[PDB]
């Protein structure tokens, strides 16, 4: 029905926090995913940019 694309930059060690039910500085205070999340999480190393 609709799709929402969210984008941001984080440390490689923080990508593991971008998942449903996660906690930590990013998941708690920056970007929280719901427990019943229905989307996809895509991430890549940007050390070149």
């Amino acid at each position: 029905t609709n799709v929402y694309a969210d984008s941001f930059v984080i440390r490689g060690d923080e990508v593991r926090q971008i998942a449903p039910g996660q906690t930590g500085k990013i998941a708690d205070y920056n970007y929280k995913l719901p427990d019943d999340f229905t989307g996809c999480v895509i991430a890549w190393n940007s050390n070149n940019l």
Partner: protein, 49 residues
């Protein structure tokens, strides 16, 4: 601690008769891995042992 024990002879310290503040540990963000089994990291500060 300045020097840790060798894993074959892992050191153990009893913690007792004291008040803890696990939020200081979890929110330190100095740890690469912080995994809790059978107890939630966030609720850990609201419990007694």
């Amino acid at each position: 601690a300045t020097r840790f024990a060798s894993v074959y002879a892992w050191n153990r310290k009893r913690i007792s008769n004291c008040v803890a503040d696990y939020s200081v540990l979890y929110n330190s963000a100095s740890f690469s891995t912080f995994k809790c089994y059978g107890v939630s990291p966030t609720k850990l500060n609201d419990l007694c042992f």
